[PDB]
Amino acid sequence: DAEFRHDSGYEVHHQKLVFFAEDVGSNKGAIIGLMVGG
Amino acid sequence: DAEFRHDSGYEVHHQKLVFFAEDVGSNKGAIIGLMVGG
Amino acid sequence: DAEFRHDSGYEVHHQKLVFFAEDVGSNKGAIIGLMVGG
Amino acid sequence: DAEFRHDSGYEVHHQKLVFFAEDVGSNKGAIIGLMVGG
Amino acid sequence: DAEFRHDSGYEVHHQKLVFFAEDVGSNKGAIIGLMVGG
Amino acid sequence: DAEFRHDSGYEVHHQKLVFFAEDVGSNKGAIIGLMVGG
Amino acid sequence: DAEFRHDSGYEVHHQKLVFFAEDVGSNKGAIIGLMVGG
Amino acid sequence: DAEFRHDSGYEVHHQKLVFFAEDVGSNKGAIIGLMVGG
Amino acid sequence: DAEFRHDSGYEVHHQKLVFFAEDVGSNKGAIIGLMVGG
Amino acid sequence: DAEFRHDSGYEVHHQKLVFFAEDVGSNKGAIIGLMVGG
Numbered sequence: 430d431a432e433f434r435h436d437s438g439y440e441v442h443h444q445k446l447v448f449f450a451e452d453v454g455s456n457k458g459a460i461i462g463l464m465v466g467g
Numbered sequence: 468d469a470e471f472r473h474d475s476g477y478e479v480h481h482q483k484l485v486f487f488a489e490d491v492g493s494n495k496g497a498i499i500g501l502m503v504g505g
Numbered sequence: 506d507a508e509f510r511h512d513s514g515y516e517v518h519h520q521k522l523v524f525f526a527e528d529v530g531s532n533k534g535a536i537i538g539l540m541v542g543g
Numbered sequence: 544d545a546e547f548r549h550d551s552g553y554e555v556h557h558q559k560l561v562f563f564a565e566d567v568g569s570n571k572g573a574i575i576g577l578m579v580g581g
Numbered sequence: 582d583a584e585f586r587h588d589s590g591y592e593v594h595h596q597k598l599v600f601f602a603e604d605v606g607s608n609k610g611a612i613i614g615l616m617v618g619g
Numbered sequence: 620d621a622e623f624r625h626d627s628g629y630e631v632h633h634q635k636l637v638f639f640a641e642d643v644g645s646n647k648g649a650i651i652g653l654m655v656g657g
Numbered sequence: 658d659a660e661f662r663h664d665s666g667y668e669v670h671h672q673k674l675v676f677f678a679e680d681v682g683s684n685k686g687a688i689i690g691l692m693v694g695g
Numbered sequence: 696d697a698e699f700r701h702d703s704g705y706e707v708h709h710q711k712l713v714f715f716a717e718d719v720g721s722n723k724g725a726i727i728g729l730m731v732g733g
Numbered sequence: 734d735a736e737f738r739h740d741s742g743y744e745v746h747h748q749k750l751v752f753f754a755e756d757v758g759s760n761k762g763a764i765i766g767l768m769v770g771g
Numbered sequence: 772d773a774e775f776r777h778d779s780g781y782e783v784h785h786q787k788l789v790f791f792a793e794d795v796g797s798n799k800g801a802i803i804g805l806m807v808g809g
Contacts, residue, residue, distance in 0.1 A: 431508045432469045433487050437476045438513045438551075446730055446768060448486045448524045448690065449509050452493045454722040454760075455528045456644075456682040459497045459535045462714065464636060464674055466543035466581070467504035476513075484692055484730060486652065492684040492722075494644040500676065502636055504543070507546045514551045514589075522768055522806060524562045524728065525547050530760040530798075531566045532682075532720040535573045538752065540674060540712055542581035542619070545584045552589045560806055562600045562766065563585050568798040569604045570720075570758040573611045576790065578712060578750055580619035600804065608758075608796040616750060616788055621660045628665045628703075638676045639661050645680045649687045656695035656733070659698045666703045666741075676714045677699050683718045687725045694733035694771070697736045704741045704779075714752045715737050721756045725763045732771035732809070735774045742779045752790045753775050759794045763801045770809035 433449055471487055509525055547563055585601055623639055661677055699715055737753055775791055 430468045430506045433471045433509045435473045435485065435511045436513070437474070437478050438515060439476060440478050440513050440516050442480050442518050442521060444482050444520050444730065444732065445480060446484045446522045446728060447511065448728045448766065450488045450526045450529055452490045452495055452528045453488055453727070454492045454530045454682055454684040454720055456494045456532045456535045456720040457528055459494045459499065460501060461499045461535065461537045461681070462638065462674060462676045463501045463536060463539045464672065465503045465541045466672065482692065482694065484690060486690045486728065491689070492644055492646040492682055494682040500636060500638045502634065504634065506544045509547045511549045512551070514553060516551050516554050518556050518559060520558050520768065520770065522560045522766060523549065524766045524804065526564045526567055528566045529765070530568045530720055530722040530758055532570045532573045532758040533566055537573065537575045537719070538676065538712060538714045539574060539577045540710065541579045542710065544582045547585045549587045550589070552591060554589050554592050556594050556597060558596050558806065558808065560598045560804060561587065562804045564602045564605055566604045567803070568606045568758055568760040568796055570608045570611045570796040571604055575611065575613045575757070576714065576750060576752045577612060577615045578748065579617045580748065606796055606798040613795070614752065614788060614790045616786065618786065620658045623661045625663045626665070628667060630665050630668050632670050632673060634672050636674045637663065640678045640681055642680045644682045646684045646687045647680055651687065651689045653688060653691045655693045658696045661699045663701045664703070666705060668703050668706050670708050670711060672710050674712045675701065678716045678719055680718045682720045684722045684725045685718055689725065689727045691726060691729045693731045696734045699737045701739045702741070704743060706741050706744050708746050708749060710748050712750045713739065716754045716757055718756045720758045722760045722763045723756055727763065727765045729764060729767045731769045734772045737775045739777045740779070742781060744779050744782050746784050746787060748786050750788045751777065754792045754795055756794045758796045760798045760801045761794055765801065765803045767802060767805045769807045
């Protein structure tokens with residue numbers, strides 16, 4: 430829940446890779462199979 | 468829930484890759500199978 | 506839940522790689538199979 | 544949950560690698576298979 | 582849960598590597614298979 | 620893609636929970652952002 | 658992709674929990690951001 | 696991708712827990728950010 | 734990718750716990766951030 | 772990727788615990804941040 434930025438100046442490459450990931454295959458903060466008696 | 472940006476200046480490549488991901492295959496903050504007695 | 510930034514100045518490469526990861530295959534803070542008697 | 548930054552000045556390489564990782568294959572702070580009698 | 586930074590001045594290399602890791606294949610602070618009688 | 624069954628004999632509880640899940644928040648076998656040159 | 662079964666005989670509890678999960682927050686076998694030159 | 700079974704004989708408990716998990720917050724066999732020159 | 738089984742004979746407990754896990758917060762066999770020149 | 776089994780004969784306890792784990796918070800066989808020149 431935050432801003433993504435990628436701004437380019439003069440750049441030269443044969444190949445380049447940029448990858449951002451905050452949650453991939455995640456269950457962060459999840460509640461699964463919880464139970465309570467009362 | 469935030470701004471995505473990608474602005475290009477003079478750039479030259481054979482190949483380039485840009486990828487943004489905030490949630491892919493995620494259950495963040497989910498509640499599954501919860502139960503309460505009262 | 507925080508800002509990502511990558512700004513380029515004059516740069517030259519044969520190949521370059523940038524990769525950000527906060528949660529990949531993670532269950533941070535998750536609750537699984539919890540139980541309580543009362 | 545904190546800001547990522549990578550800003551480039553004049554730099555030249557044959558190849559360069561930048562990699563940030565906070566949680567990859569992690570279960571930090573998770574609760575699994577907990578049980579209580581009452 | 583803290584800021585990452587990497588800012589470049591004038592630098593020249595044949596190859597360079599930067600790698601940050603806080604948790605990779607970790608179960609820090611996790612609770613697994615706990616049990617209590619009452 | 621397979622049969623689900625749950626048959627009950629004489630059973631008594633204060634509370635009970637049964638939950639089956641094959642894919643929840645999943646991208647199994649998916650192809651995303653693929654590319655080919657020829 | 659296989660059969661699920663749960664058959665009950667004479668059983669008595671204050672509380673019981675059964676939970677099956679094959680893929681929850683998973684990207685098993687997925688292809689993301691792939692690229693090829695030719 | 697295999698059969699799950701749980702069959703009950705005469706059993707008595709105050710509380711019992713059964714939990715099966717093959718993939719939870721997993722990226723098994725996934726390909727992310729791959730690249731090839733030709 | 735294999736059969737799970739749990740069959741009960743005459744058994745008595747105050748509390749019992751059974752938990753199976755093949756992959757939880759795992760990236761087994763995954764490829765992340767790979768690159769090739771040609 | 773192999774069969775799990777747990778079959779019960781006549782058994783009596785105040786409390787008992789069975790726990791199987793093949794990969795929890797693991798990156799077995801993973802490739803992260805690899806690079807090649809050609």
